[PDB]
């Protein structure tokens, strides 16, 4: 596997890389992102977000800094946990959480986190140049239906989707102040104006849910979310663009995540040659438990053949993750090509999983 972001050899001399992201462009361009964790693996540290671009199918990469933190705190200023999407116009949107203090983003403060904000950048030139950082939460002109008891929120860490009519849907996670407690939930946000303004959906029926991704299936939204301390990835379905949610049985609890806290994963849809709509999930098996997060595997479900059980297709990273921070992955499928980026002992590796999709396509 090619080392995309190397902790031992990078142009920023960063000691650690975390939270990968990948987008397969329509013309074959591969666009990837990752946290630039300069001082180490800690989440509450000095972090920017990088971009690696390839015009030769992953052989050579051009590196840049897509987003910088607010530059306020040389120790804690950070923009992190990227959530990306490609609109129908080709516009590439990146959504990230922004902080500059110490402490968990969801549990530290009992009121709205003062240094918290959601920053968004977009590129109209296929990832060559990026726009200015646009604050989505400093006022109320960009995001509608933001709960008043919001401690903070950010993207679902991964990739969004585009509906039939062109509506962009982004996975999201929110922390809410409810009855002297801080409960965090998963949900979605959507934009009908190419990402200029957004409307916030409602929370999923269960707390302790966070990082997630949604797919579109015949107008509905099917979510595969991180369900902490449940041992599995939860799944919900929505028929009103994320306003109401029901448990999606065919996927709920099917992907096990081992003991301890959950872990981020990716959930994308692919349409095989026989017309079937399949779901591809990447997540560590975590058979060794807790934050070890071993064996980043790729699972498959056939929505048009739901009697067939979820299949383990391959394990792109059949090793233990680093307990300091690992296990995150992101899949991207476009034009019968499948690619993955994942964390690998402080590094970010890349793989082309297209031959495995060809085994699925049965052509």
Author numbering: 20 to 382
Q: Any passages from the paper?
A:
We explored this hypothesis by determining the structure of NanHGH33 with bound Neu5,9Ac2 and an inactive D62N mutant in complex with a trisaccharide comprising N-acetyllactosamine terminating in α-2-6-linked Neu5,7,9Ac3 (referred to as SAc3LacNAc). Neither structure showed any significant perturbation of active site residues relative to either the unliganded or Neu5Ac complex. The 7-O-Ac group of SAc3LacNAc also projects up into a preexisting space in the active site. The center blade of the three has a solvent exposed tyrosine residue, Y310, that projects into the active site. In the case of the NanHGH33 SAc3LacNAc, however, the O4 of the galactose residue in the +1 subsite is oriented toward the aromatic ring of Y310, possibly making this less optimal interaction. Presumably, a similar interaction involving Y310 occurs when NanHGH33 binds α-2,3-linked sialoglycosides but in an as yet unknown but more favorable relative orientation of the galactose in the +1 subsite.
The genomes of most C. perfringens strains contain three separate genes encoding highly conserved GH33 CAZymes targeting sialic acid glycosidic linkages: the nonsecreted 43 kDa NanH, and the two secreted 77 kDa NanI and 129 kDa NanJ. Here, we present the structural and biochemical characterization of the GH33 catalytic domains of the three sialidases of C. perfringens and probe their substrate specificity. The catalytically active domains, which we refer to as NanHGH33, NanJGH33, and NanIGH33, displayed differential activity on various naturally occurring forms of sialic acid. We report the X-ray crystal structures of these domains in complex with relevant sialic acid variants revealing the molecular basis of how each catalytic domain accommodates different sialic acids.
